[model samples]
Target: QLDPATLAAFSAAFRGELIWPSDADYDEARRIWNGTIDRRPALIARCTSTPDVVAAVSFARKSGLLVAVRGGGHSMAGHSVCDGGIVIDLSLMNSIKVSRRLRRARAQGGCLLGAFDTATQAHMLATPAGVVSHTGLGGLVLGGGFGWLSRKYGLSIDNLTSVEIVTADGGVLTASDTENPDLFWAVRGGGGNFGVVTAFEFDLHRVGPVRFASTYYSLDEGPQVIRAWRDHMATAPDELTWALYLRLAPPLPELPADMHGKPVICAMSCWIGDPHEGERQLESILHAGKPHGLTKATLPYRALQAYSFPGAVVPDRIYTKSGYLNELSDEATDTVLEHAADIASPFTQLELLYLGGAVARVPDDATAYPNRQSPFVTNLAAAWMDPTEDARHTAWAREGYRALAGHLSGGYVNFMNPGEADRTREAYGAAKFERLQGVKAKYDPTNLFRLNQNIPPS
Candidate 1:
């Protein structure tokens, strides 16, 4: 039932390209950052402007097609594209403008973290966005962005100044403290449920090359190494941030030959302040339970971000589960260790990110982000190669996550898996979730933006 007429009609009124299934680049256009998703969008509106976004949204709503919005196309849940629906691809809209005097930056929704970082770093300024360079700026900011700068500057939403969005009614809006303030508050952690955010305005901070370190250890050394790292983080300065990851050792010179491909504690840190102080602040981690290998360097903030996700490597089918912890108690670290034995996939691992300092100073209700009080955030992820082995890795992560459920407090929507959903209330909590629903009802009453972490108008 692919309608030639609908595509023609929309393209006739669109200022951008309208891609169909038979188009030369349709296959490439439909592909997202996550390789596991092979959705075939009936029409791809490669929008280049705010008006284009409005037209695309209008067309999807009018045609009764499931609507998906693709920014950087990296939704952990893979909601960036849809089957037999219309995808408002914003890739063509990638643009950036930075103002040093204003100490702020304006980035198009289509812009990736790498593009924005490059632009801002050129001005010796940075925003609190995710560590992954290729990750879409819009999706990360909308989901309460967390990164190396988070503990120092705060989440991406905290630096967000305004957002230009196209509502469900096909009207454009500028959401900020001065304009459509209510819409502004809700979109901070509300995802794309409110509307298609065409552009984002953010307050930039001064940050650049500084001390950074990453150490690795065997799984047996995890309990002591991780807990010591946790205790170290408790007194760690706000200028410093770190994470302890239980990851598969890659074949790299930095790691020992025997340790390659085995589970290792990869504790990484970045210092936003004095290089000398950063070294002292992260020194204990090097001694944290006889690490297998360690490396330290001073590089630009952008360099570190690039290392997080690297040069636009498309994600394979990944089963990732997220949860927050009040504290990394003995029982909790021990529990994580117990499940460490069940990691069936070489790429399967768990990560613990310290989440305090500036993030905790803000009141819980200050924005829609619900998990700020969470001192540490956890991600139970399983990444495998063969599609046939999906069940094995997924089961391992699912069962492992279940065992840690008692210790889990809150959830991070950005890291949530497609296999997870019902925790909509848990993402924003009951009080804020209801408020978000009201905002969704007001601007997107018909739930036209239902493709993403959907929040119904009701």
Candidate 2:
């Protein structure tokens, strides 16, 4: 534990806001997206700038306090907070600068997808990010971000042009393709192993107001829908992106009132090219089954990106299990539906994202993000309202995840939780994992940034 005098000196050295257990907002400060995580940190430094981040790291190192970097606080494993340790919170460092001519955007570590979209959409450009708007760009991009735009623009890390990070030694460095290329390659999907990244510069893609398709269908049509979606998406144009989900619709105002509490297969499509041609290509699936409701129409790209979660806030207890699928065979499709039907909680959901297009065009060895050969990625997520039900819900999610494990190539690091540490090697694959370990050893020899999905030093 830090002495009072030491805490005061540390606070005085940085320009950021500091919160202790005695502070009024300490409870909120320690809260993360996953409700299952209820850790109390020794200090919460709400960093406002790169200097603040540097100071926080130095303070933690000198005090021998375990440090965790909090950016958007959306980790499924609740890694945003560390018990009895120091937290370098970047919530207040949300500053975004976009350069349309250069097709790049500089985003502060604390910035979320909503902030990023608000800034980049002005220029009619965006980079691949998570489906949820509230997810932090720092963790998402660094962990190989993927979402609706991924099919067209590629993974979030693929578009990452540069990153400004604070090392364990209180030094700031920029990592990019041209500078510190090894670090840059590792950061693409290595998680926060090397250092505390304060800001990221991403290369944006031109995408715009176009026809977006979204609707929910009955679960009975799972096999047919999967087959059609798989076949149609196999050779789909680069301008088109699609995702399918088997979930229980909550009793929300936006959803059909009568369909509330019903099990449905929700699918979304975004066509970056001509709306008419896009419509023609999507007509088969659109008209395949009796639609619960079709919200397909020409809308702003930002609108489509924000449509997934609407205004859903992060839940306290979130159990996320994910893996990549090379193909959606009959056996695999049946396994998905079987688990989907056995969902124990109303909040549990199963989603499969079609991968290909721009994401697949990149070679597997070009960057650290290896699952380019996979045709799809699947996630079984359970979000609960009650904290007491964490264990039960997590177990259910795990069982569902295991049922389809054979079809999975490996796990996505961003979606990994605490107990999944042994699976880390599987997440990055053998070759990439070896390279990441080398990068971790080079940039963080002492493993200062070891609180996250850690890649230990060699």
Candidate 3:
């Protein structure tokens, strides 16, 4: 436990507020995205600036406290906080600045995708991020972000130009292509093994004011839609980004009355090209299956992005298992359909994302993230409202994942859960993992920042 004097010293260094177990908001502060995680940190330092981060690191180290860094608090494995340890909370560090002339955007570690999107969309720009707006740019980029725009542009880390980070020893460092090059390389998809990143600079892309398409079909068309989507996406243009989902709609007002609680196959796509041409290109699958529901129109890129996922809301429970697929063969498609059919809950979903447009253009060794050779990525998620159903939900997710595991090239570390360390290493191949270790040794040899899919110092 931290002595009173030490805690006071640490508290004085932060511009933002701090929360302890006895604080009024302690219960809410301890909550994470995953309901299954119930860790209670000894102290929570809500950092507002880089200096606060440095001071927290120093205090945690000097006090011999395990430290966890929280950015948007969306870690699937609850790596944002430690039980009976110090938490360097970055929620108050939320800030975003975009330079239209330089085509770049800088986001503080705590900014969620929705907040960042609102800022960037003002200038008609964005980067690859998760479908959920609540996902943090920090954790997503650090763990190799793959989302809607991934196929067209690249992974989130690929667009990262630089970062401002506080290392394990409480020293602030700026990492980029020309400065601290090794650390920069390691931070790209390397997980949070080296330090707490306070700010990130991303190379922005021109995404908006263009036309896109999205539609949903019935579950009975699963086989045809899956096969057609797989084949069509295999050679689809780089401008076209899409995903196939088998989902059961919750009893929400937005969903059709008959569709509520019914299984369906949803195809969401964003074509970053001419509206007419995009529609023509999507003609095959557009008419392939009998539609239970459809919503497709040409709209501004921002509008299209907002249409599907308006805002990121924290779910009560989110258990996700993800992996890369080289090919969606008949056998693989069958496994996916079978799993979709056996989904245990209305909140459960099976998703297949087409990879390897611009994402694959980057060499496997270009960054710490491997699995570039794969053409597709799949994620199975089981979300729920009750804590008692954790095991059941997790098992459903695991079984769905197991059915398609044979086709997976490797796992995506960001989407991985606890007890999957072996899979995490496989995500970054042995060679890259070794280099990442060397980088960790140089910057964080004492492993002060040893949380969130941690990598041991060499």
Candidate 4:
């Protein structure tokens, strides 16, 4: 139990507005993107400045309380909020600065992927980031973001230059290659175990209009379409990236109404090179399946970035299991196809992302993100509305994942489930995990920041 006097003292030291359980906006402020997470922190510190973040860390340490940091609140495992603890809410700290001459974009902790995209797009410069517009840049970059542009330009962390963080000792530090090199290595893919990052600087690339393709095939065409995508991706340029999914067709113009809510196969692609070249290279897929629907156009990269924003940011109860794939053999593809056909919920989906190119160019030891050899990522996910159906939804995802587990290599730290902490070392690999532990001991010797995909201090 928290002592009233001590809590009051902590509040006095905090510069930001303090929100309590009785506050009118408490419910609104505490809600995260995942509906399955209903955490209620004892206090919500709406941090507005760097000093406020420092104070929040100090207060949490002094009170001996578990601390969770809320950026854009898109954590798949709900690491941003905790029950019976203090939440250092950075929602008010969103501030973005884009430098055209330097070709860089710096975002504050609270900035969302959409917000950053908007700023960089204005300068005609962009970087790989989360497809979900509301995903927190801090968490996205920390866990190694994989998006449409990643194959061409690498992940959000791959473009990351540095970050201003408040360590467990309440000291502000900069993490980058030149300074605090070890800390820089850890935050690249170690999650938020070291501290709370308040600011991020990312390298930007020249990006403009490009060809965008969307297609859906009836369930009968799943095998043909998927194998074609698998083959095409092998020789596709780094400038072109795509994702394949087995899901129910939404009520959209391209999809036939008769197929709505029925299982189907779909592929969404974006080509960042010359428009004409992109169209030509995409021919294999455009002409492959006896498609139920197909759509293609040339749009600004910014528009393509936001194409699925609405669907990606929905507030639904979701459970996701992710695996990195080195090979998609016929047998492995069959497992994925079978899992898609076995979802317990209509909204559940099986996603396969094409990963490689720029993402693999970086040496594994150069950063904490170690799954570079994999060329694809398989995501087994389930979504629902009823709490009573939680078991049903989670079991569907788990069993499906288990079937495909042997064919997989590792996991994406960002999309890991709650009970899979044991896989942390596997995600980081043995070498990187040991280095992360050393960095943890240096920055947070007591393991104060162990709430999210924790890497314990050795």
Which one is best on lDDT?
4
Backbone collision tally, model 2:
3
**TM per candidate:** 0.96, 0.95, 0.95, 0.96
lDDT of 2 at 275: 78
Tell me how candidate 4 scores on lDDT.
0.84
lDDT of 1: 0.83
**CA lDDT for candidate 3:** 0.81
- Residues 153-256, candidate 2, lDDT per residue (tens digit)? 88898888889988889999999889988988888888888888888988888877877887788778878887888888888877788788887766666577
Model 2 is weakest, by summed lDDT over 10 consecutive residues, at 308-317
Clashes found in each candidate (C-alpha, N, C closer than 3 A): 0, 3, 0, 0
Q: Which stretches of candidate 2 lie over 4 Å from their true place?
A: 3-9, 252-258, 310-314
The C-alpha lDDT values of all candidates are 0.83, 0.82, 0.81, 0.84
Q: Residue 355 error for model 3, in Å?
A: 1.6
Candidate 2 C-alpha error for residue 34, in Å:
0.3
Question: How do the residues 192-308 of candidate 4 rate in per-residue lDDT, one tens digit apiece?
Answer: 888999999999999989898887777677777788888988888898887887877777766678987777777788788899988886665676677667778898878888787
TM-score of 2: 0.95
Comparing 1 with 3 on lDDT, the higher-scoring candidate is 1
| Model 4: lowest-lDDT 10 consecutive positions | 307-316
Decoy 4 TM-score against native: 0.96
lDDT of 3 at 231: 86
Pairs of colliding residues, candidate 1: none
Model 1 regions more than 4 Å off: 1-9, 309-315
